[PDB]
């Protein structure tokens, strides 16, 4: 009977809220509501240990920078996220989110999460990327970002298809349980 | 005793069981209205008029006790006489729905709730004053003993006679309900009583509401005398500094009660919080004082403006909820407040969300 706290951060509309709702409610919300501040709970079992998981959802938008530090205080593991369909989204990993996290949550383990795996092989997505001379994200550099930012590990998922979502929260829990 | 025992066994001769049981309930309404009017006239004659004549207290203090007794009496007199006017055309009373609307619907409804409100609003405060006035003055205690021993009161004290209006307004809905129980369903009559019944509950709510509001205004007055906002003059927190000379009296109270404040890890503080129209003020108690302080971990402001907060539920704790202060000019903050029970948490949440919406 152990409690752990997780905070999810990443750019606006990169799939932070949806990933929590799918995991906690097991349904995907269809209307987009930009998060200001939201609180969720979920239960999971990992390696024969029972864990309550508080999900702290944060705002990716700039206007709410000032509210975000209020979710950081007692964090056991951070889910740092980016979208695979947004390539500007990963350059914000080392330029905004890592600095922010390491400042408010030092030595607290970080999981790097790639969101919207379903949109890799979606034709409608790749065509709009070309207009900015850009292409979707592969798993090698994801791995690299993670090695570069001293992340605990690395994960790809899809909230729409439900693919690999629980696999995310297992590592997050192992991270919190470890040390 | 019964309606059946009055009128005659000759007169009930040709009537169904439903019609009789219906007459029994209607009669109860008529008879108890006659009692209530008389109770009001006892108040008038034995208390109000004697106090007026004999100058037992100042005029404004007496007007507070019985603000509009003559007018209240006029209401139940005109209604009672219309009942009696109905009885004139035979002991079997027929269509009665038109009578009930004439008192609980439209203008009538407006008239009744205004007067009853004004008569009951301050009453609990006035009665307490009367109780204290009796310990203060020999001369007043003598009068109260004289008046309560009067035959017309039939061994009842002031407190019992005066509360009768509320008792009466709280009885109207149950009394209609029984009439509706014994009315032919799907007639014009049936629907109209339902309409009358519904408005009785509205009037009930309206009057209880005004009592609730007046009692709140009076509680704030009290709280203002015990308020120590001294620490707010030393400022430092720009939001707290606004409320160095607060004054609760200028606002209405929505809700109040004890919440434990989770200021930190293994640091708690018991508060008594007030929900007002525009503000949430967090109050700490010494003895009889109500403190406004800042409280350290950079400090928290004891007063939050509702037009600059967010309300959220703690998902791991169904007792606790967050208030997030989003006021500019200072760093934003998380107030984690714990309620007594889960049901109490829901009551706070509900009233909080409503007040924030109306503020914004
Ligand atoms: N194709 C696809 N779309 C997704 C996925 N996850 C979320 N979305 C869509 O992207 C939009 C934003 O997702 P959301 O989770 O609300 O972003 P957010 O990170 O919470 O955005 P914010 O709260 O920081 S402003 C929504 O319209 C949703 O439909 C996904 O896995 N695949
Ligand atoms: Mg979000």
Coordinates of C-alpha atoms and ligand atoms in Angstrom, one line a residue:
Chain A
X1 CA 0.0 0.0 0.0
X2 CA 2.3 2.8 -1.4
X3 CA 1.6 6.3 -2.7
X4 CA 3.5 8.1 -5.6
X5 CA 3.0 11.4 -7.4
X6 CA 3.5 11.9 -11.1
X7 CA 3.5 15.2 -13.0
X8 CA 3.2 15.3 -16.8
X9 CA 4.7 18.2 -18.8
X10 CA 5.2 19.1 -22.4
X11 CA 4.1 21.5 -25.2
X12 CA 0.5 22.7 -25.7
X13 CA -1.7 20.1 -27.5
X14 CA 1.0 17.4 -27.5
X15 CA -1.5 14.9 -25.9
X16 CA -0.9 15.3 -22.1
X17 CA -4.5 15.4 -20.9
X18 CA -5.7 12.6 -23.3
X19 CA -2.9 10.2 -22.2
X20 CA -4.0 10.6 -18.5
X21 CA -7.7 10.2 -19.2
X22 CA -7.3 7.1 -21.3
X23 CA -5.1 5.5 -18.6
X24 CA -7.3 6.6 -15.7
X25 CA -10.8 6.5 -17.2
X26 CA -9.9 4.1 -20.1
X27 CA -11.9 6.3 -22.5
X28 CA -10.5 8.9 -24.9
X29 CA -12.1 12.4 -24.7
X30 CA -12.9 13.9 -28.1
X31 CA -13.4 17.6 -27.5
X32 CA -10.1 19.4 -26.8
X33 CA -10.1 21.5 -23.6
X34 CA -6.8 23.3 -23.0
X35 CA -5.7 22.4 -19.4
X36 CA -5.0 25.1 -16.8
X37 CA -4.8 22.7 -13.8
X38 CA -6.2 19.2 -13.2
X39 CA -5.9 16.4 -10.7
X40 CA -6.5 12.7 -11.3
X41 CA -5.9 9.3 -9.6
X42 CA -5.1 5.8 -10.9
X43 CA -4.2 2.4 -9.5
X44 CA -1.6 0.1 -10.9
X45 CA 0.3 -3.1 -10.0
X46 CA 4.0 -3.4 -10.9
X47 CA 6.4 -6.2 -9.9
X48 CA 4.1 -7.4 -7.1
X49 CA 3.7 -4.0 -5.5
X50 CA 0.5 -1.9 -5.2
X51 CA 0.6 1.7 -6.0
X52 CA -1.7 4.7 -6.0
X53 CA -0.7 7.2 -8.7
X54 CA -1.7 10.8 -8.5
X55 CA -1.8 12.3 -11.9
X56 CA -1.0 16.0 -12.0
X57 CA -2.0 17.5 -15.3
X58 CA -0.3 20.7 -16.4
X59 CA -0.7 23.5 -19.0
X60 CA 1.5 23.3 -22.0
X61 CA 0.4 26.8 -23.1
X62 CA 2.7 29.9 -22.4
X63 CA 0.0 31.9 -20.6
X64 CA 0.1 29.4 -17.8
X65 CA 3.8 29.1 -17.3
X66 CA 3.2 30.9 -14.0
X67 CA 0.8 28.3 -12.7
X68 CA 2.8 25.3 -13.6
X69 CA 5.4 25.4 -10.7
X70 CA 2.6 24.8 -8.3
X71 CA 2.3 21.1 -9.5
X72 CA 6.0 20.4 -9.1
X73 CA 6.5 20.3 -5.3
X74 CA 6.6 16.7 -4.2
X75 CA 7.1 14.8 -7.4
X76 CA 8.2 11.2 -7.5
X77 CA 8.4 10.9 -11.3
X78 CA 8.0 13.2 -14.2
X79 CA 6.5 12.3 -17.5
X80 CA 8.1 14.6 -20.0
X81 CA 6.1 14.5 -23.3
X82 CA 6.2 15.4 -26.9
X83 CA 4.1 14.8 -30.0
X84 CA 5.4 12.7 -32.9
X85 CA 3.2 14.8 -35.3
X86 CA 4.8 18.1 -34.1
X87 CA 8.5 18.2 -34.8
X88 CA 9.0 21.6 -33.1
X89 CA 7.7 19.7 -30.1
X90 CA 10.9 17.7 -29.5
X91 CA 13.3 20.7 -29.8
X92 CA 11.3 22.1 -26.8
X93 CA 12.5 19.1 -24.8
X94 CA 16.1 20.4 -24.3
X95 CA 15.3 24.2 -24.6
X96 CA 12.3 24.6 -22.2
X97 CA 11.1 21.4 -20.4
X98 CA 14.3 19.8 -19.1
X99 CA 15.6 23.1 -17.8
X100 CA 12.3 23.7 -16.1
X101 CA 12.1 20.3 -14.6
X102 CA 15.6 20.1 -13.4
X103 CA 15.2 23.4 -11.8
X104 CA 12.0 22.7 -9.8
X105 CA 12.6 18.9 -9.5
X106 CA 16.3 18.1 -9.2
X107 CA 17.5 14.4 -9.2
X108 CA 13.8 13.4 -9.7
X109 CA 13.7 10.7 -12.4
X110 CA 12.4 11.7 -15.8
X111 CA 10.6 9.6 -18.4
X112 CA 10.6 10.8 -22.0
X113 CA 7.3 10.0 -23.7
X114 CA 6.5 10.1 -27.5
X115 CA 2.8 10.7 -28.0
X116 CA 0.5 10.1 -31.0
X117 CA 2.2 7.0 -32.4
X118 CA -0.8 6.4 -34.6
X119 CA 0.0 9.5 -36.8
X120 CA 3.4 8.1 -37.9
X121 CA 2.0 6.2 -40.9
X122 CA -1.0 8.6 -41.4
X123 CA -0.8 10.1 -44.9
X124 CA -2.7 13.3 -44.0
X125 CA -0.1 14.1 -41.4
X126 CA 3.1 13.7 -43.4
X127 CA 1.9 16.0 -46.2
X128 CA 1.4 19.0 -43.9
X129 CA 4.9 18.4 -42.4
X130 CA 6.4 18.7 -45.9
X131 CA 5.0 22.3 -46.2
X132 CA 7.5 23.2 -43.4
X133 CA 10.3 21.0 -44.9
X134 CA 9.7 18.6 -42.0
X135 CA 9.1 14.9 -41.4
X136 CA 7.8 12.8 -38.4
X137 CA 9.9 11.5 -35.6
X138 CA 11.6 8.1 -35.4
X139 CA 12.6 6.1 -32.3
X140 CA 16.4 6.6 -32.5
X141 CA 16.6 10.3 -31.7
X142 CA 13.8 9.9 -29.1
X143 CA 16.3 7.5 -27.5
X144 CA 19.0 10.1 -28.0
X145 CA 17.0 13.1 -26.5
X146 CA 16.6 10.7 -23.5
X147 CA 20.3 9.9 -23.3
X148 CA 21.1 13.6 -23.8
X149 CA 18.8 14.9 -21.1
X150 CA 19.8 12.1 -18.7
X151 CA 16.3 10.5 -18.8
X152 CA 15.5 7.3 -16.9
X153 CA 14.2 5.7 -20.1
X154 CA 12.1 6.2 -23.2
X155 CA 8.7 5.3 -24.4
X156 CA 6.3 5.6 -27.5
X157 CA 2.5 5.4 -27.1
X158 CA -0.9 6.2 -28.7
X159 CA -3.8 7.5 -26.6
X160 CA -6.2 7.2 -29.5
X161 CA -5.4 3.5 -30.3
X162 CA -4.6 2.8 -26.6
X163 CA -1.4 1.3 -27.9
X164 CA 1.5 1.1 -25.4
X165 CA -0.2 3.4 -22.9
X166 CA 0.0 1.2 -19.8
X167 CA 3.6 0.4 -20.7
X168 CA 4.3 4.1 -20.1
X169 CA 3.0 4.1 -16.5
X170 CA 4.8 0.9 -15.6
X171 CA 8.3 2.5 -16.2
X172 CA 7.1 5.7 -14.5
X173 CA 6.2 3.6 -11.4
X174 CA 9.5 1.6 -11.5
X175 CA 11.2 5.0 -11.6
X176 CA 9.4 6.2 -8.5
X177 CA 9.8 2.9 -6.7
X178 CA 13.5 2.7 -7.6
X179 CA 15.4 4.6 -4.9
Chain B
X1 CA -64.6 16.9 16.7
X2 CA -64.7 15.4 13.1
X3 CA -66.4 17.1 10.2
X4 CA -68.6 14.0 10.2
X5 CA -69.5 14.5 13.9
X6 CA -70.4 18.1 13.0
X7 CA -72.8 18.9 10.1
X8 CA -74.8 15.6 10.5
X9 CA -75.0 11.8 9.7
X10 CA -78.1 12.9 7.6
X11 CA -75.8 15.3 5.6
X12 CA -73.1 12.7 4.9
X13 CA -75.8 10.3 3.9
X14 CA -75.2 10.2 0.1
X15 CA -71.4 10.6 -0.1
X16 CA -68.5 8.4 -1.1
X17 CA -65.7 7.6 1.3
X18 CA -63.3 9.7 -0.8
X19 CA -65.5 12.7 -0.6
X20 CA -65.9 12.4 3.2
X21 CA -62.2 12.0 3.8
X22 CA -61.8 15.0 1.5
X23 CA -64.2 17.1 3.6
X24 CA -62.3 16.0 6.7
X25 CA -59.1 17.5 5.4
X26 CA -60.7 20.6 4.1
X27 CA -62.3 21.2 7.5
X28 CA -59.0 20.8 9.2
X29 CA -57.6 23.7 7.0
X30 CA -60.6 25.9 7.9
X31 CA -60.5 25.2 11.7
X32 CA -56.7 25.6 12.1
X33 CA -56.8 28.9 10.1
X34 CA -59.4 30.2 12.6
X35 CA -56.9 29.2 15.4
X36 CA -54.0 30.8 13.7
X37 CA -55.8 34.2 13.2
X38 CA -56.8 34.2 16.9
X39 CA -53.2 33.5 17.9
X40 CA -52.2 36.5 15.9
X41 CA -54.8 38.7 17.6
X42 CA -53.6 37.5 21.0
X43 CA -50.1 38.7 19.9
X44 CA -51.6 42.0 18.9
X45 CA -53.8 42.7 21.9
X46 CA -51.8 41.1 24.8
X47 CA -48.3 41.9 23.7
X48 CA -48.0 44.4 21.0
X49 CA -50.7 46.9 22.1
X50 CA -49.7 46.7 25.8
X51 CA -46.1 47.3 25.0
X52 CA -47.0 50.2 22.8
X53 CA -49.3 51.9 25.4
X54 CA -47.1 51.4 28.3
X55 CA -43.8 52.5 26.7
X56 CA -41.8 49.5 27.7
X57 CA -39.2 49.9 25.2
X58 CA -38.3 52.5 22.5
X59 CA -40.5 52.5 19.4
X60 CA -37.8 51.3 16.9
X61 CA -37.1 48.3 19.2
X62 CA -40.7 47.4 19.4
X63 CA -41.2 47.8 15.6
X64 CA -38.4 45.2 15.2
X65 CA -40.3 42.6 17.2
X66 CA -43.7 43.1 15.5
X67 CA -42.9 44.8 12.3
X68 CA -46.2 44.5 10.5
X69 CA -48.6 42.6 12.7
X70 CA -51.7 44.5 11.6
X71 CA -50.9 43.8 8.0
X72 CA -50.2 40.1 8.7
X73 CA -53.5 39.8 10.6
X74 CA -55.3 41.4 7.6
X75 CA -53.9 38.7 5.4
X76 CA -55.1 35.8 7.4
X77 CA -58.4 37.6 8.2
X78 CA -59.4 38.2 4.6
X79 CA -58.6 34.6 3.7
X80 CA -60.4 33.3 6.8
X81 CA -63.4 35.3 5.9
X82 CA -63.5 34.0 2.4
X83 CA -63.5 30.5 3.8
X84 CA -66.4 31.4 6.1
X85 CA -68.2 32.9 3.0
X86 CA -67.8 29.6 1.3
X87 CA -69.2 27.7 4.3
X88 CA -72.3 29.9 3.9
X89 CA -73.6 27.9 1.0
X90 CA -73.7 24.5 2.6
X91 CA -71.5 22.3 4.9
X92 CA -70.3 20.2 2.0
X93 CA -67.7 22.5 0.5
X94 CA -67.3 22.0 -3.2
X95 CA -64.7 23.6 -5.5
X96 CA -61.9 25.0 -3.3
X97 CA -59.1 25.5 -5.8
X98 CA -60.1 29.1 -6.5
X99 CA -59.9 29.9 -2.8
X100 CA -56.4 28.6 -2.5
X101 CA -55.1 30.6 -5.5
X102 CA -56.6 33.8 -4.1
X103 CA -54.0 33.5 -1.2
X104 CA -51.0 31.6 -2.7
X105 CA -50.9 32.8 -6.3
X106 CA -50.0 35.9 -8.3
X107 CA -50.2 39.3 -6.4
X108 CA -51.4 37.4 -3.3
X109 CA -48.3 35.3 -3.3
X110 CA -46.2 38.4 -3.5
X111 CA -48.1 40.1 -0.7
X112 CA -47.9 37.1 1.6
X113 CA -44.2 36.4 1.3
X114 CA -43.2 40.0 1.6
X115 CA -45.1 40.4 4.9
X116 CA -44.3 37.1 6.4
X117 CA -40.6 37.6 5.5
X118 CA -40.5 40.9 7.2
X119 CA -42.3 39.5 10.2
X120 CA -40.0 36.5 10.6
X121 CA -36.6 37.6 9.4
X122 CA -35.2 39.3 12.5
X123 CA -37.4 37.5 14.9
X124 CA -34.8 35.1 16.4
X125 CA -32.5 38.1 17.2
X126 CA -35.4 40.2 18.7
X127 CA -36.4 37.2 21.0
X128 CA -32.9 36.9 22.3
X129 CA -32.9 40.7 23.1
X130 CA -36.2 40.2 25.0
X131 CA -34.7 37.3 27.0
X132 CA -31.7 39.6 27.9
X133 CA -34.0 42.5 28.6
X134 CA -35.8 40.4 31.2
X135 CA -32.6 39.8 33.2
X136 CA -31.7 43.5 32.8
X137 CA -35.0 45.0 34.0
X138 CA -37.2 44.0 36.9
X139 CA -39.9 46.1 35.3
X140 CA -39.9 44.1 32.1
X141 CA -39.7 40.7 33.8
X142 CA -42.8 41.8 35.7
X143 CA -44.6 42.6 32.5
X144 CA -43.7 39.3 30.8
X145 CA -44.9 37.3 33.7
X146 CA -48.1 39.3 33.8
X147 CA -48.7 39.0 30.0
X148 CA -47.9 35.2 29.8
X149 CA -50.2 34.5 32.7
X150 CA -53.1 36.2 30.8
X151 CA -55.9 33.8 30.1
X152 CA -56.0 34.7 26.4
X153 CA -52.4 33.2 25.9
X154 CA -53.8 29.9 27.5
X155 CA -50.5 29.2 29.3
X156 CA -48.3 30.0 26.3
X157 CA -45.1 32.1 26.4
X158 CA -44.2 34.7 23.8
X159 CA -41.8 32.5 22.1
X160 CA -44.5 29.9 21.3
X161 CA -47.1 32.4 20.0
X162 CA -44.8 34.3 17.7
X163 CA -43.1 31.3 16.0
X164 CA -46.7 30.4 15.0
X165 CA -46.4 32.1 11.6
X166 CA -43.5 29.9 10.5
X167 CA -45.3 26.8 11.9
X168 CA -48.2 27.9 9.8
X169 CA -46.3 28.4 6.6
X170 CA -44.5 25.2 7.1
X171 CA -47.9 23.4 7.5
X172 CA -49.6 24.8 4.4
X173 CA -47.9 22.5 1.9
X174 CA -48.7 19.3 4.0
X175 CA -52.3 20.4 4.3
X176 CA -52.7 21.0 0.6
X177 CA -51.0 17.6 -0.1
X178 CA -53.7 15.7 1.8
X179 CA -56.4 17.6 0.0
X180 CA -54.8 16.6 -3.3
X181 CA -54.6 13.0 -2.0
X182 CA -58.4 13.0 -1.8
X183 CA -59.2 14.8 -5.0
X184 CA -60.4 13.3 -8.4
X185 CA -57.2 13.1 -10.5
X186 CA -57.1 14.8 -13.9
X187 CA -59.7 17.4 -13.2
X188 CA -59.3 21.2 -13.4
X189 CA -59.6 21.3 -9.6
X190 CA -56.8 18.7 -9.2
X191 CA -54.3 20.6 -11.4
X192 CA -55.0 23.9 -9.7
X193 CA -54.4 22.7 -6.1
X194 CA -51.1 21.3 -7.4
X195 CA -50.3 24.8 -8.6
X196 CA -51.3 26.2 -5.3
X197 CA -49.3 23.5 -3.4
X198 CA -46.2 24.3 -5.5
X199 CA -46.3 28.0 -4.6
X200 CA -46.6 27.3 -0.8
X201 CA -43.2 25.5 -1.0
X202 CA -41.9 28.5 -2.9
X203 CA -43.2 30.9 -0.2
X204 CA -41.7 28.6 2.4
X205 CA -38.3 28.8 0.7
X206 CA -38.6 32.5 0.2
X207 CA -39.3 33.2 3.9
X208 CA -36.8 30.7 5.3
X209 CA -34.4 32.4 2.9
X210 CA -34.9 35.9 4.3
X211 CA -34.5 34.5 7.8
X212 CA -31.3 32.9 6.6
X213 CA -30.1 36.1 5.2
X214 CA -30.9 38.3 8.2
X215 CA -29.3 35.8 10.5
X216 CA -26.2 35.9 8.3
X217 CA -26.0 39.7 8.4
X218 CA -26.2 39.5 12.1
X219 CA -23.5 36.8 12.4
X220 CA -21.2 39.1 10.3
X221 CA -21.8 42.0 12.6
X222 CA -20.7 39.8 15.4
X223 CA -17.6 38.5 13.6
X224 CA -16.5 42.1 12.7
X225 CA -16.2 43.0 16.4
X226 CA -13.9 39.9 16.9
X227 CA -11.8 40.5 13.9
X228 CA -8.1 41.2 14.3
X229 CA -6.6 42.2 10.9
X230 CA -3.6 43.9 12.6
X231 CA -0.9 41.8 11.0
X232 CA -2.1 43.0 7.6
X233 CA -0.8 46.5 8.3
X234 CA 2.8 45.2 8.2
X235 CA 2.0 43.9 4.6
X236 CA 4.8 42.4 2.5
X237 CA 2.2 40.2 0.7
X238 CA 0.5 42.7 -1.7
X239 CA -2.7 40.7 -1.9
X240 CA -3.1 40.5 1.9
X241 CA -2.3 44.2 2.2
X242 CA -5.6 45.1 0.5
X243 CA -7.4 43.9 3.5
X244 CA -5.8 45.7 6.4
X245 CA -9.2 47.3 7.2
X246 CA -11.5 44.6 5.8
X247 CA -15.0 45.2 7.1
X248 CA -17.2 42.0 6.5
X249 CA -20.4 44.1 6.9
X250 CA -20.3 45.4 3.3
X251 CA -20.7 41.8 1.9
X252 CA -23.2 39.0 2.2
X253 CA -22.2 35.6 3.6
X254 CA -22.9 32.5 1.5
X255 CA -21.5 29.7 3.7
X256 CA -19.1 29.1 6.7
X257 CA -17.6 26.3 8.7
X258 CA -14.4 24.6 9.9
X259 CA -11.7 23.4 7.4
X260 CA -8.3 22.1 8.2
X261 CA -5.6 23.7 6.1
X262 CA -2.7 21.6 4.7
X263 CA -0.1 24.3 4.6
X264 CA 2.8 21.9 4.2
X265 CA 4.0 18.3 4.7
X266 CA 3.2 17.4 8.3
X267 CA 2.0 21.0 9.0
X268 CA -1.7 21.6 9.5
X269 CA -3.7 24.6 10.7
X270 CA -7.4 24.6 11.8
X271 CA -9.4 27.5 10.4
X272 CA -12.9 28.7 10.2
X273 CA -13.6 29.9 6.7
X274 CA -16.2 32.3 5.4
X275 CA -17.5 32.3 1.9
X276 CA -18.7 35.7 0.9
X277 CA -20.0 37.1 -2.4
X278 CA -16.6 38.3 -3.6
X279 CA -14.2 36.8 -1.1
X280 CA -13.0 33.8 0.8
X281 CA -11.6 34.9 4.1
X282 CA -9.6 32.3 6.1
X283 CA -9.8 32.9 9.8
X284 CA -7.7 31.5 12.6
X285 CA -8.8 31.5 16.3
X286 CA -6.9 32.5 19.4
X287 CA -9.5 32.6 22.1
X288 CA -12.4 34.8 21.2
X289 CA -10.5 36.5 18.4
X290 CA -10.7 36.0 14.7
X291 CA -7.2 36.4 13.3
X292 CA -6.1 37.5 9.8
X293 CA -2.5 36.5 9.3
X294 CA -0.2 35.7 6.4
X295 CA 1.4 32.4 7.3
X296 CA 4.7 31.3 6.0
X297 CA 5.9 28.1 4.1
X298 CA 7.0 33.9 0.7
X299 CA 3.6 34.0 2.4
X300 CA -0.1 33.1 1.9
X301 CA -2.8 35.8 1.8
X302 CA -5.6 35.1 4.3
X303 CA -8.2 36.7 2.0
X304 CA -8.7 35.5 -1.6
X305 CA -10.7 37.3 -4.2
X306 CA -13.2 34.9 -5.9
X307 CA -12.7 36.6 -9.3
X308 CA -9.2 35.3 -9.3
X309 CA -9.3 31.7 -8.0
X310 CA -9.7 28.2 -9.4
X311 CA -11.6 25.4 -7.7
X312 CA -10.4 21.8 -8.1
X313 CA -10.9 18.4 -6.4
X314 CA -8.1 16.5 -4.8
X315 CA -8.4 13.1 -6.5
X316 CA -6.4 11.1 -3.9
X317 CA -8.5 12.7 -1.0
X318 CA -12.3 12.8 -1.2
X319 CA -12.2 15.0 2.0
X320 CA -9.8 17.7 0.5
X321 CA -10.1 20.3 -2.3
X322 CA -7.8 22.8 -3.9
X323 CA -8.3 26.5 -4.2
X324 CA -5.7 28.1 -6.5
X325 CA -5.1 31.8 -6.1
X326 CA -4.4 33.3 -9.5
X327 CA -4.1 37.0 -8.4
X328 CA -1.4 38.9 -10.3
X329 CA 1.2 41.2 -8.6
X330 CA 2.2 38.2 -6.5
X331 CA 3.2 34.6 -7.0
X332 CA 0.2 32.3 -7.4
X333 CA -0.6 29.7 -4.7
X334 CA -2.2 26.4 -3.8
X335 CA -4.5 26.3 -0.8
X336 CA -5.3 22.6 0.1
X337 CA -8.3 22.6 2.4
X338 CA -9.8 19.5 4.1
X339 CA -13.5 19.0 5.0
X340 CA -15.0 17.0 7.8
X341 CA -16.7 14.4 5.7
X342 CA -17.0 13.5 2.0
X343 CA -20.4 15.0 2.0
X344 CA -19.1 18.2 3.5
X345 CA -16.4 18.4 0.8
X346 CA -19.1 18.2 -1.9
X347 CA -21.2 20.9 -0.2
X348 CA -18.2 23.3 -0.1
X349 CA -17.2 22.5 -3.8
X350 CA -20.8 23.1 -4.9
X351 CA -21.1 26.4 -3.1
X352 CA -17.6 27.5 -4.2
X353 CA -18.1 26.8 -7.9
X354 CA -21.4 28.7 -7.8
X355 CA -19.9 31.8 -6.1
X356 CA -16.8 31.9 -8.4
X357 CA -19.1 31.8 -11.4
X358 CA -21.2 34.7 -10.1
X359 CA -18.1 36.6 -9.2
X360 CA -16.7 36.1 -12.7
Ligands
LIG1 N1 -4.1 11.4 -33.5 C1 -4.0 11.6 -32.2 N2 -4.5 12.7 -31.6 C2 -4.4 12.9 -30.3 C3 -3.7 11.9 -29.4 N3 -3.8 12.4 -28.2 C4 -4.4 13.6 -28.2 N4 -4.8 13.9 -29.4 C5 -5.6 15.1 -29.9 O1 -4.8 16.2 -29.8 C6 -5.5 17.3 -29.1 C7 -4.8 17.7 -27.8 O2 -4.7 16.6 -26.9 P1 -4.6 17.0 -25.4 O3 -4.2 15.8 -24.5 O4 -5.8 17.6 -24.9 O5 -3.3 18.0 -25.4 P2 -2.6 18.6 -24.0 O6 -1.2 18.1 -24.0 O7 -3.3 18.2 -22.8 O8 -2.7 20.2 -24.4 P3 -2.7 21.3 -23.2 O9 -3.6 20.8 -22.1 O10 -1.2 21.3 -22.7 S1 -3.0 22.9 -23.8 C8 -6.9 16.8 -28.9 O11 -7.8 17.4 -29.9 C9 -6.9 15.3 -29.2 O12 -7.9 14.9 -30.0 C10 -3.2 10.8 -30.0 O13 -2.6 10.0 -29.4 N5 -3.3 10.6 -31.4
LIG2 MG1 -3.3 19.1 -20.6

